[model samples]
Target: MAAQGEPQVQFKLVLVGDGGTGKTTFVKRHLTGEFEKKYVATLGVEVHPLVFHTNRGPIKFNVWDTAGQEKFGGLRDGYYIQAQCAIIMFDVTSRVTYKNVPNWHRDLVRVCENIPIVLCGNKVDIKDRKVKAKSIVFHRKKNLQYYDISAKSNYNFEKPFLWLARKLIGDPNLEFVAMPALAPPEVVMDPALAAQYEHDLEVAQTTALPDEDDDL
Candidate 1:
């Protein structure tokens, strides 16, 4: 961990995905210090703390790599509790892995509320892929930021990290603040109640009304 007053910024980023989706591979490529090829499944969640020295400052990332297995259930929610940002990954060569993205997103929303997320499509090195452009477009429609990455070739890998780094510590003029804790979903099904709430809280705050007590 970097010191508080040190010339560096520390950010907590969690990487999540279903099993065999290349989450560990992605982190290893960036943080391993030396390049080596290895296939290993993370048990539960593995923590990788890395420091990147950039022009802005030395950014330290405490990245949580979660296991993709049924036995590791409930682990993601726990890791998400203190996360500032998240990288939701999927395998571009497997449609099932891509399908799991919504569930992952829902879990993150439940625990982290509205925090910054980077959607990653891994394994782009595979020429014969099951996931297609249409699937990517569907996610894009939801206004999600995504990148097509290949951990093996290191293609499009830096883009997402750079995007996240900028989001974390870039733009000194715009101070970054941590998001508030997540809260339970509020049910406002009744139209009248919803309308009243909106009118009193939303519109009244924006619109100016003339005083009714003053007589012309």
Candidate 2:
């Protein structure tokens, strides 16, 4: 936990994904107190300071939640300019979202090259998930960490930030001292289904990764 005199550190964390992939909803789950219900689409980019109480002290991430829809606005390459780390997300129910991941990855690394990144397959709580664990090879090919998360259900929401923090701080043993108070989720994950996804992810790890294609 952060003592009164402990110094707080800040890093720029960028969140990018296709529209409606739960980027804003995911970041809102980190809101410290008062969970507000403002689920509007972000126009350009919204910057929020997220603080995580860690054993060493308190670490803050200046989260830049960039807009995904081009019609809303296009401020991507410039937004990712100086980020310390990033999370690229896609909706599991929409395979098209997953398909655009390469473009997202290419754009991200172009500016913030070599920064630690995590790929999140959001909305995994949905029963009709189109993207399977074994089919998720973008992260494996790009060498970025991956996590299946559900913003509505609040499953694995903290993982992307945790992994990013570990890489940024160069401490694999880093752990959060206190979990943030989150908003009430719209849904909850089925334990049996979650177990299946976990097993699938594990199997994907052992299976040979597919080669990159030029489709994207």
In candidate 1, stretches whose alpha carbon ends up further than 4 angstroms from where it belongs are 1-7, 32-44, 67-76, 170-216
Identify the runs in model 2 with alpha carbons over 4 angstroms from their true place.
1-6, 33-44, 67-74, 208-216
TM-score of each: 0.66, 0.84
Q: Compared with the true structure, what per-residue lDDT tens digits does model 2 show for residues 35-87?
A: 33222253355677777776666778878765455336445566788878788
Predicted candidate 1: what Cα RMSD to the true structure? 16.0
Cα TM-score of candidate 2:
0.84
Candidate 2, overall lDDT? 0.76
RMSD of each: 16.0, 4.2
How big is the positional error of residue 120 in model 2, measured in Å on the Cα after superposition?
Answer: 0.8
